[PDB]
Each structure stands twice: as C-alpha cells, then as structure tokens.
Amino acid sequence: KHLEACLEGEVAYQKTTTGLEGFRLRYQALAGLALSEVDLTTPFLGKTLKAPFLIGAMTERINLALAEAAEALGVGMMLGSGRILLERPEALRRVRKVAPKALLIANLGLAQLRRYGRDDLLRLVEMLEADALAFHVNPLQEAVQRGDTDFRGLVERLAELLPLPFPVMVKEVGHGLSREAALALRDLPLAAVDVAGAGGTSWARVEEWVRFGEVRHPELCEIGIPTARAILEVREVLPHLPLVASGGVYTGTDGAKALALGADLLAVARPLLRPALEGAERVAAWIGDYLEELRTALFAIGARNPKEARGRVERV
Amino acid sequence: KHLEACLEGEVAYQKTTTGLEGFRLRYQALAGLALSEVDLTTPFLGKTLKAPFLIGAMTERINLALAEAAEALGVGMMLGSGRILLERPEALRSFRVRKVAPKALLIANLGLAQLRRYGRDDLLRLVEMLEADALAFHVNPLQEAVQRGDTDFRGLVERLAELLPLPFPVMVKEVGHGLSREAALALRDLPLAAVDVAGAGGTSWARVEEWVRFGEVRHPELCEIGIPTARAILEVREVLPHLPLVASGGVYTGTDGAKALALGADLLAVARPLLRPALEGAERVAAWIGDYLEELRTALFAIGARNPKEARGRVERV
Amino acid sequence: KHLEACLEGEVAYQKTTTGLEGFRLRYQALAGLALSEVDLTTPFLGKTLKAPFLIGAMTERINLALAEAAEALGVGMMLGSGRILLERPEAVRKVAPKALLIANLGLAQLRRYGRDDLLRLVEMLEADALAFHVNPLQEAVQRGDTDFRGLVERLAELLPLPFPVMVKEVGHGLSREAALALRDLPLAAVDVAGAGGTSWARVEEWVRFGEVRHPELCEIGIPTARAILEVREVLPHLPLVASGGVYTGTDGAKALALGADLLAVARPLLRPALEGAERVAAWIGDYLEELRTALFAIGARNPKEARGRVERV
Amino acid sequence: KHLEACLEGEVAYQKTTTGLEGFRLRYQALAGLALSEVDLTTPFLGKTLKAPFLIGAMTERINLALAEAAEALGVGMMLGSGRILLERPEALRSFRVRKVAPKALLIANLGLAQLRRYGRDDLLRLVEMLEADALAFHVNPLQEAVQRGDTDFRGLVERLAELLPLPFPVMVKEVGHGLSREAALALRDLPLAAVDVAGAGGTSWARVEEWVRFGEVRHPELCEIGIPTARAILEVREVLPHLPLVASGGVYTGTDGAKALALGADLLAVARPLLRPALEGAERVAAWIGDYLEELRTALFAIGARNPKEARGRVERV
Numbered sequence A: 001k002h003l004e005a006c007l008e009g010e011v012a013y014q015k016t017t018t019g020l021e022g023f024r025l026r027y028q029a030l031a032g033l034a035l036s037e038v039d040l041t042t043p044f045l046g047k048t049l050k051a052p053f054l055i056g057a058m059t060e061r062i063n064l065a066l067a068e069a070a071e072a073l074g075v076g077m078m079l080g081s082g083r084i085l086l087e088r089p090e091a092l093r094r095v096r097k098v099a100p101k102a103l104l105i106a107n108l109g110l111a112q113l114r115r116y117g118r119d120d121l122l123r124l125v126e127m128l129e130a131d132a133l134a135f136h137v138n139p140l141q142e143a144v145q146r147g148d149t150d151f152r153g154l155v156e157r158l159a160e161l162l163p164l165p166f167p168v169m170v171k172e173v174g175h176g177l178s179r180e181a182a183l184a185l186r187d188l189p190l191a192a193v194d195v196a197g198a199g200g201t202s203w204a205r206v207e208e209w210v211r212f213g214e215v216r217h218p219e220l221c222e223i224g225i226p227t228a229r230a231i232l233e234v235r236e237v238l239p240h241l242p243l244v245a246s247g248g249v250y251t252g253t254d255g256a257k258a259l260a261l262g263a264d265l266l267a268v269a270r271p272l273l274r275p276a277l278e279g280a281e282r283v284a285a286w287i288g289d290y291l292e293e294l295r296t297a298l299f300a301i302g303a304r305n306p307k308e309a310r311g312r313v314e315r316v
Numbered sequence B, D: 001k002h003l004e005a006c007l008e009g010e011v012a013y014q015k016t017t018t019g020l021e022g023f024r025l026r027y028q029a030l031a032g033l034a035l036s037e038v039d040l041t042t043p044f045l046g047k048t049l050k051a052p053f054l055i056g057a058m059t060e061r062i063n064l065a066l067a068e069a070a071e072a073l074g075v076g077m078m079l080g081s082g083r084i085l086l087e088r089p090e091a092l093r094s095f096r097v098r099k100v101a102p103k104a105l106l107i108a109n110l111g112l113a114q115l116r117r118y119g120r121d122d123l124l125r126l127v128e129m130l131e132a133d134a135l136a137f138h139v140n141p142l143q144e145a146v147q148r149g150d151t152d153f154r155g156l157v158e159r160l161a162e163l164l165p166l167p168f169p170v171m172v173k174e175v176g177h178g179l180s181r182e183a184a185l186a187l188r189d190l191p192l193a194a195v196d197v198a199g200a201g202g203t204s205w206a207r208v209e210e211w212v213r214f215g216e217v218r219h220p221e222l223c224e225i226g227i228p229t230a231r232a233i234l235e236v237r238e239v240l241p242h243l244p245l246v247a248s249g250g251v252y253t254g255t256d257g258a259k260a261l262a263l264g265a266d267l268l269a270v271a272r273p274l275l276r277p278a279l280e281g282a283e284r285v286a287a288w289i290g291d292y293l294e295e296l297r298t299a300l301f302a303i304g305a306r307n308p309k310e311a312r313g314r315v316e317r318v
Numbered sequence C: 001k002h003l004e005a006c007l008e009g010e011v012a013y014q015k016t017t018t019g020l021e022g023f024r025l026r027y028q029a030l031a032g033l034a035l036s037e038v039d040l041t042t043p044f045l046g047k048t049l050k051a052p053f054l055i056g057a058m059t060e061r062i063n064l065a066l067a068e069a070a071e072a073l074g075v076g077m078m079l080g081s082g083r084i085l086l087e088r089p090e091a092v093r094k095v096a097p098k099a100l101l102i103a104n105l106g107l108a109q110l111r112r113y114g115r116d117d118l119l120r121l122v123e124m125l126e127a128d129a130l131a132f133h134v135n136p137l138q139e140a141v142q143r144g145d146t147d148f149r150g151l152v153e154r155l156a157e158l159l160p161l162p163f164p165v166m167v168k169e170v171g172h173g174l175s176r177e178a179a180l181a182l183r184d185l186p187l188a189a190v191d192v193a194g195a196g197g198t199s200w201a202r203v204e205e206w207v208r209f210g211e212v213r214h215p216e217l218c219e220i221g222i223p224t225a226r227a228i229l230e231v232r233e234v235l236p237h238l239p240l241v242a243s244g245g246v247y248t249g250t251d252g253a254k255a256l257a258l259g260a261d262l263l264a265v266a267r268p269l270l271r272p273a274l275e276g277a278e279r280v281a282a283w284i285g286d287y288l289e290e291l292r293t294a295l296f297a298i299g300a301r302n303p304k305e306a307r308g309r310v311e312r313v
C-alpha cells in the first residue's frame, strides 16, 4: 500500500540529512573503561528497556515479527496508526500474543483527537494493551497526501485531555519537531517527545510516491528539521522530557551520535521494515546488530551508558 | 534569437546559485493550522492577486498563452519589453494580450536605459498602447555589455527619478544578475511601487546573450557575475524595509518561493521555466503556475505561515 | 591475515581523513636558506636519527626488510607486537646492530604482564624502548579482551621503567583527554596515531567479514592533524610522534608543523616490505627527501623549526 | 625544453587553487556608469600600459609573438630569464625582442639566485643588452629544490638589499608558488618598484620541474605547496600598502583579473595560458590578450569600478 513505497521507492530524503555526519564522536582510547561495563539499560514510559531503542511505528504480519523481536531484545515498539480500531474494534484481530512483557506504544496522531475522545483513547490503548500512546503530528505528509489537513487547535485538545491514565508522547514522522513545536508542547505533561527528524524516510516524498510513483516536488519533500538539529532544538526547550531520536538514525554509531546530542532513546523505522518481512529472528538480528554497534560506539566515546554520551561529540 | 536560446541553450547559471539552497525552511509540525486557511491572496501594484506571483518578461503566441493563464489564475504578468512597440507603433498588435486578459495584472516593460531616448510621454503612450497597470524599468549592464549592446547607464536613476511619480505605478527590476544592497540604496527615494531583485541563480542573461553571439558561452565566469537571489532579497530588504519586493531568478519552485518570501520577498516571479510551457499553450502554463502555486501553499503551511506576509522570518541558514 | 587484510582489503579510512589536507604549508619563498642546510637529524628516546621518522609496528621476513632499511637510512623502527614473544618465548637486531628498535606491547597486556616480562621482552628482542599501544575500538571490533579498566594507573606504577616507554594508539588516534590521562606519567613520548590512514577497526571487520559491515563505527577516531594539536596542547614538551596516514613528506611536514617532533608510517611501508629492504629504503629515503624539500620550502632549518609553519587551509 | 611540460604536462595545480573562486564580485546594476568610461590605463614601472596586464615571464620565437602582441595591445611583458645571456654573452639580437616591439614596457628577468654570481654591473649590462625597462628577480626555492637545480637562497635579499636603487626599476616576483606575508616582510625595506606575488593555483613550477625529471608528478602534494594567489595578494598587500602588486599565477581570465584587482592588486599577469597562442603566434596571442582585457573591462563595468584601482574591495567572500 504505502508499504510498496517504503519497500520499493526512493522515499529516503535526497538532500536533507539527519545532520549527524556533521558531528564527530569524541573517541577515547584512554577512557579505561571496559566494553563489558557500557550498560544499554534504559527505563522508558515506565517499563525498563534493555537498550535505548524503539522499533519505530510502521503500517499486521510485519508487526508480529517486530513484536517478537522487541520481546527477544528488550526494546520497545510503536504500533502503526490505530486509526482503523477507533471505529473497527475487531480489526484488533494486536501483538501482545507474541510480546507479553515488551514496551508497546500505541500510536494515533494528534489529528484523530478531533473525531475521538478521552474514552476512545483509554479504550484504544487497552484494546492494544499498550503501555503508552504516541500522538503523531504530521502536517506536511498530510498536506502532501491530500489528506485531513486541519491541525488547527490540536494542541489545546491534547492539552486538555491531558494527564491521561497511561503515558503520552507527541512525535513527528520524519519531517521533525522544531524549537517552536517544542515550545508548544511545553507543559503539556507529556512523558516523551519523539523528534522524528529529517534525514531518513521523508513522509512527503512517500506520500508523493503513492500519488505519482515518482516525486514531482523533490524539494517540498525535503522540508523538515534534520534529526540532529531537532534533538538539539527540542532539548534546549524540554531539558527533562525523554527525547527519542528517530529520522534516519539507522546505524548504532549514528545512534550514539544522536545520544550524544542529548537524546535518550533511538528509534528506527524504515530500515527495520524489510527484515520485518522475513520475520523476527531476522529483525532481531538487525536490531541486536545496531545495539552491538551502539555499545561499541558508546565504549569508543567513554560513555559507560547511553545518558553518559551527552557532550561526547564535536562539530566535524 | 534569445527565444531559440532560452529553449536550446544551457543558459542557466552553471556555477552561481540563487543560494536559496543555503536556507532551511523552518518547518512547524505543531504550527497548529488548517491548510484550508492558508491564503495566497496578495494586493500588488494597486490591483489584487490570487497568488503572490507574476509570470515574468518574455519576447507573442507565448505572450497569449501567458496572459490567459494570468487571467485564469489571479496572478500577474510582466509583459516583455515594448521597446519594439515604442519603435514601431503599428506593430502594437501583440500586447492585444489585454484581450485575452481583461482584469489581469499587466506590467509594462522597458529598461531603465531606454530612458536615454524616451520621455514621460513616450512612457504613458507605452502604458496605454498596452493597457496595463504599471511600468517596470529593467536595469541590466552586464547583460548589455555582453550583448555588445549599448551600454551607457549614466544618470539613469536620476533621469528616472526626475520623471517620477507617473500616472501608473512603477517598479525597478534586473534581468537576474540581480540587485545588490547598493542598487537598493540608489533606489531609496524613487517613489517606486515595487523592485524586483531578479538575482542570479536562474537564467544568466549574460550567458544567454553570448549563446546568441557565439552559440557557446565563451566567458563562463563573466557570465556568473551576479547577486544571487537569496542574497539579493536579503540585501535589498535591509535598505528597503517596506516597499514591495519581487523575488525572481530561478525561484523555480513553490518551496523556494517560500524560502524567498521567508527571506523577505512579497511576491515571486518565474520566467524562463514558463517559456517551454507557453509553447504547448495557456492551459499548460497554468498547470505549471497552478502547481507551483499549490507547492507554495503547502510549504507556507508546513512553515506555519497563514498567508505570504507571514513567512518573513521562517527560514534559516543551512 | 591481519596481514593480507592490510594488503588485499580497503582498510584505509573511507570517510574520516587525517585533516592534514586542511592545512597549508605556510610556504616561504624568501625564507632565504640553503636546501643543503636543512638538517633532518633528531635525537629520539636516548638514540639519534638521521630523520624524524619511524617505521611502524607491523604483523620476521618483513621485519627484516624493514629493520634493514632502518639501519641503512638511520631512522627509528617500531617492532610489531611481541605478544607472541612473551607467550612462546622460543621464537632480528642482527640485521640492524645500532638502529633504534622500539619494542611493542599493548597497554592491555599489563593485564597479564608485569615489569619482569616487560624487561625480558625488551631484552630478548634487543631494544632501546617499549611503546605500549592502546586501542579499545580496534579491540572491541575484533571481539576480544576488551577490559581496558585501570590500564593507565597500572602503567603509572609499573612505570618509571629501566628504558624509555612510549604510549601509542593504532590509528584511531589519541584525544586531548587521552593525553590528559597520560599527563602525569613519566613517558618518553606519545605517538598519537590518528585517524585518516589505516583504520584498525576496518582491518578487524575485513577479517571477520571480508567486508566492513559497520563503516561508520570504523571511521570513529581522532584525525591525525587534530590529535597532534590536542595531544600537544596538553603535553607541551614531550616528544610526539605523528602517525596515522602521514603518508607523504609534505604531510610529514604539516604534521611536524602542527606539533609533531617526529613521524611514523606503516601500512604504506608494507607492500615495499614484501619486495624487500632495498625498496623499503627506496620508499623512505624518498619520503625523507620529500620532507627535506618541504621542510625547506617553509623555511624550517630542521624539524624543530616547523612548529609554527602551517595554517588552516 | 621545459616547453612541453607547459605544453603537454598536467603541470597546472591539481588541488590548490588561486583562491579567487572564494571571492564574489559585487555586481552593480545601478552603478550608473558606462562601459565606455571604464578605463584600463595603468602606468607601471615608469612607462604607461594601455591595460594593467603583463604577459608573463616565459621560456625565442614564442618571445617575438608576445613581444609584438605586447606592442599592439599596450600591455607589459617580462622577457624570460636573461639566464644564458649574461654569461653566454650572446644576443640583442636573441631572444630580442625590441625590434618587433619598440615602445612596449619590457621587464627583464633573472632570479635572485644569480645575485650570488652577478655584479651590480652585470645587471645594467643585462638590462641594456636586452634594452629592457626594469628587472624582475624571480625567487623560486621550491621550484629550485624540485628541479635538483641550485638550491642555495642563503642571503640573497641583502645581496639585493645592498646593491639596490639600480638605475632601472626592479621588482621581486615569485613563479607560481607565491609570496607570503613573511616573504613580503623581507622585501619591506628594499626600495623595490613592484612585487609580483605570483601565487599558487595556476601553473605549478614544482609539478613542471617534476614532469621533466619524471614525465609525471611523483609528489603531487609537494608540488602543491604554495601560497594561493588571492591569499598572496591579500597578504603581500597587507605589508607593502604602496608597492604596485602584480597578481599573477592562475589569473587566467579577466573576471578573475578583476577579482584579483579588487583583492588589492594593480597589475595582472598571465603566462602558461599565453604560451600556446604564443606558438600560433603574435596575432592570436593578441586575440587572447585583447579578449581577456575586453572581459576585464566588462567585469570592471559590472562591479561599478571606473578603472582597475577602483576595483579594491568590490568583492565579498562567497
């Protein structure tokens, strides 16, 4: 569906980048620490993850694979647009069968707050038996896919539905959250921001690859906040909220770089998707590769753990 | 034979860019607005437009194609130069245009330098001949000198200044070698309605010119001389904090539109890219303008700007 | 192996670069001096060389060729790791009587080694100094012993030794903070061995996979030019070797220009080592005359005199 | 000779550049001046050139081409190294060049190294043997090294220092690896008439030297040591505010000519590229040259400058 674009099309950004190639890892030959004691263990949205990683949201055989990998690996998982479920409740025909203990994030999209209402959300979130809810905010994509294009007053509605019984994050989808995105999110009691930055998959470009099987407006589709900038920007404003770096953060090294710009967890999506198509055990491989690298990067930089990486980079 | 060249010759600047690509549109995911409510409507030169846009000067089936789209669309049109017009008034049967474009925005074209030859009266005769809403003198030394033109530009600002405020409103433009902060300085009193900065990055009139005079570009470098558009807008805006600014010079996509507006332009203007379109005629033109205009709207919306004045500021250095 | 990785595989850094190419030999046309008068002679680690230069650690037909060239041209040599030698004690100073042989251990071996073995290693081999190489990133990638806990402090006590000792990376470079860690220790030198040349992490991947599976990880490093710079703000006077793809004399000279007392090349010295001793010197002598000329062209009478003579391109 | 190195080698810098691509000409649409009044006339080393050009020092039938072109065109010219002449007593006669070029400004050159073995009195001799107008000593350590030629620049500048104010004017020039700021400081006291900063970015004498020895460049990187031209003009100017500077070395196009001019040069010089016209001879060298000046003029006209000196500062860092 979109599935065909992510899999088949040149949907990756063609000119913007995460910006992380702009930073270089401060390498610490004499840090006198031991691979050994670089500890990926990171708590998130109230479950203790085994490394600071979320399989990032994608859109029913695919999820099952990720879901098992998530379990096997003590990573976390966001869970496509539950958009359908909010008036098709037995399209829950759903992932906790293969993933009891894993951290599930249900994900929704701020816009849906305009049809649905608190209950609908408590009901979604338990429908999926998730641990938290991601609202995805996504104007460009939406604009581009000639889709529901009204983000007007979304934040107030979020604002007032607030401190919901489960954790809530706002994320973007890869055209990224700005400084001012964040000033808006500023005291909504959210549990997490996913900055979902520019650099990897462009939803814009995706959307158009569906409309025209090619990208008519290469350039619009590059609109966005390159992940590194977004981390930097968002953190500067929310010192305390846990930041998810996602958006073209496709290698664990890049991951560390991300961590070092002050982020907290990493998330991947499009790259995870093909593996997703040959089952967990494979996905599982991909992810644990990323963390094996990550660990190593963190070790190279003298960080004993993902939080200890803030600062450990300089402008290439 | 510039027409044959704009179409056949690689007359776009080869090494200079509008430098619009130095600039990141400051995308706002929680800008909190309805795309539905982003409003391109711009009042320009005493009329009112659907977009902040003008098709820009060319030089006359093409002319008709363009003026159609301009009427169809709620956008503006710089007529190509009526030098010939002034010269051969009978020949006056091209800018019929007004016929395919009754209420549209026609801007009359001339070239600051013709003012060595024409006067208040010749100007109005041009404006009426043409029946069009304003007059834009394009200044262009480097295009000139290359043309092996005439290429005396002394006193032109003041010759113009003194035949100031006319009947119709009046704008100064370049041909996309662009206007520097000092051009703008020179224009600081001249009661102009607009200034279009027409910077480098797009079609290099010098490069054109030579591709005519040789069918190749002999002095490549000479022909990248210019103030790149993003820079010119920037520049011309500090001098002229308010007077409307057109921004043209390979501002060939809606998104660069936005960047350009972001950096301080009030309107944008495409020319050469319209040319080929104005072969397959009027229809195809608007598909091109229309598309741009939509691209601009989304961008503007992605940037979190309700309408075009609202992007002043929404951009930053790559 | 590691060997034919360095030979067959593109193990050179693919993205990170030494940074030397971002520095301009401050040239000086009216420097006013004589090329004959430019003097490569440098005293290093209690001996004296005809050049500020070392052949670098490699991994006993090649060692022979190299060490030969070290005796002919009158330059340093760093022996490949004598880990094995410690291990299987019954297993080359005779090809190079009075040359500067620097013995190579590996900072992490102090995990199982102590002074005596250090001493024994220096002796069996016949050597003026001990250079301990540190390299976690290389290690971690070659899934290894990779406990680097307490290394410096261990060295620091086990130090003030009966010879010159030097610390040394392997091509991922030493940072301002590494130097810091080594600040207090009575070291004779540090060779900063920076990124931009051979990536020891690209080597170990090419060994595990014949490809570099994790490109990015393996570019992690401190580029040579900067390591010189950083190491040097910290260690204002200690001798410094600048190695890590300082593969031409002109770079030699910038390296020396940024803060280096001397230079050291390796991977590119290895193909010449295959064919043998002659060629090794044909290559170094050549480098050495490139360096003298450049040293000359920036108006530096001798290598001490190039500190200064460079700028951000 | 060396000849088809400069004819057939890749002897052009491969990586360092002139620097002039760093600079952007601040194009002035409304400078309001007239091609017409941009005047190349620039006096130099005593005689008045018709433009700020010197045909660069090169190396005997080639010399007659340039020399003539020189006259026709009003430009200066370095004769190549009086080398042989002053101790292979030889010719008036040969290379020449004054029979085919009477009025033209002829700079004769020599190379600070011969000061080692030529006496003040050998120099006056050379100069009139040649019937030249001034003397340029080229200083050229790096070339010299690469070439395994005479390598001893020890105390050449006091040698120049003591035998100074000579009857003809006298410039120090390098050859394309450029003079530094500190080069300049050494020249600061000598009563020179000019410097030719001769910078990196055009023809690399090391790569030349090397292409002789080896038919290829064995040490690319050496051969690139050098002060790029633009940096040399900035740097040398900063220290001899008053001396006429020749920007040469890579300044292969009037546009870059202007760029140099505006980085604070006064004169401009070309060699390597002049060399092959020098082979099809004097009339199409003229072509070359006059074209470069026809471009100089245009860019100067773009820039708002009425003459070469007025270009100073009329550039910005792109």
Ligand SMILES: Cc1cc2nc3c(=O)[nH]c(=O)nc-3n(C[C@H](O)[C@H](O)[C@H](O)COP(=O)(O)O)c2cc1C
Residues within 6 Å of the ligand: A002, A003, A006, A056, A057, A058, A059, A080, A081, A136, A172, A173, A174, A196, A197, A199, A200, A201, A246, A247, A248, A249, A267, A268, A269, A270, A271, A273
């Ligand atoms: C098939 C597929 C489906 C996706 N569906 C969603 C979605 O429903 N909501 C969302 O926010 N992001 C979706 N994404 C993208 C990621 O969640 C995320 O926005 C990311 O930042 C883009 O990919 P990358 O970060 O791994 O480069 C999808 C991606 C793919 C490949």
Ligand SMILES: Cc1cc2nc3c(=O)[nH]c(=O)nc-3n(C[C@H](O)[C@H](O)[C@H](O)COP(=O)(O)O)c2cc1C
Residues within 6 Å of the ligand: B002, B003, B006, B056, B057, B058, B059, B080, B081, B109, B138, B173, B174, B175, B176, B198, B199, B201, B202, B203, B248, B249, B250, B251, B252, B269, B270, B271, B272, B273, B275
């Ligand atoms: C065929 C053609 C004819 C043109 N004629 C004129 C003209 O008569 N007067 C003028 O001021 N500009 C003329 N222009 C150029 C535009 O107004 C403007 O300089 C522009 O920035 C060049 O193309 P761009 O805007 O898409 O790069 C012409 C352009 C073309 C392509």
Ligand SMILES: Cc1cc2nc3c(=O)[nH]c(=O)nc-3n(C[C@H](O)[C@H](O)[C@H](O)COP(=O)(O)O)c2cc1C
Residues within 6 Å of the ligand: C002, C003, C006, C056, C057, C058, C059, C079, C080, C081, C104, C133, C169, C170, C171, C193, C194, C197, C198, C243, C244, C245, C246, C264, C265, C266, C267, C268, C270
């Ligand atoms: C074949 C080979 C073998 C090596 N063996 C060792 C070794 O045993 N111990 C060590 O510390 N370094 C060893 N090195 C590291 C070099 O000293 C190192 O690559 C240098 O500081 C920078 O690399 P460059 O030669 O690319 O300048 C070896 C290198 C090569 C190429």
Ligand SMILES: Cc1cc2nc3c(=O)[nH]c(=O)nc-3n(C[C@H](O)[C@H](O)[C@H](O)COP(=O)(O)O)c2cc1C
Residues within 6 Å of the ligand: D002, D003, D006, D056, D057, D058, D059, D080, D081, D109, D138, D174, D175, D176, D198, D199, D201, D202, D203, D204, D248, D249, D250, D251, D269, D270, D271, D272, D273, D275
């Ligand atoms: C064929 C040729 C011969 C040359 N001969 C001399 C020479 O005898 N003496 C000298 O000082 N420079 C000589 N030059 C160099 C130029 O005079 C000058 O310094 C210049 O900067 C190098 O070429 P370019 O500037 O035109 O790139 C020669 C150049 C060429 C191309």
